[PDB]
């Protein structure tokens with residue numbers, strides 16, 4: 273790995289795409305952690321063989337994980353954490369064990385407050401159109417590096433919605449770097 277993508281998701285938007293059943297995210301109104309994804313030459317490293325998920329190793333972080341890393345689409349929170357560890361976390365296990373991996377993600381969330389960066393500019397979520405350049409600009413001004421913006425288009429209306437914001441980090445998991453990939457067009461609903 274040569275870097276990490278720290279991905280946060282916007283629950284209300286993510287829930288809108290799940291048209292089959294109920295969804296907790298509608299009740300959640302803040303950015304939550306989707307996951308911490310190790311990267312290699314521009315691609316996400318996934319499903320690396322490694323240690324099985326051990327719930328006891330993060331029992332001391334439960335209160336923080338239930339509020340910052342709740343599941344939006346899956347059955348329950350624990351299942352989501354297990355999924356993230358098995359699909360992404362194992363790929364950086366050589367340097368970060370399970371406890372360290374989850375702690376790092378929690379720290380990143382506490383240090384990267386997206387809503388706080390957007391409020392002053394009245395660019396917070398309000399169901400209206402926002403511009404990609406402006407949002408990226410507001411985050412860059414506060415944190416120092418460009419974030420990555422991820423959008424999804426509704427199959428029916430064809431409208432584009434901001435669903436995730438990515439903060440890019442070097443292999444040390446501490447040095448913020450510029451992200452260089454968005455999946456959002458010039459405008460989107462947020």
Ligand SMILES: [Mn+2]
Nearest residue numbers: 307355356359
């Ligand atoms: Mn995933």
Ligand SMILES: [Mn+2]
Nearest residue numbers: 318319355359
């Ligand atoms: Mn899968």
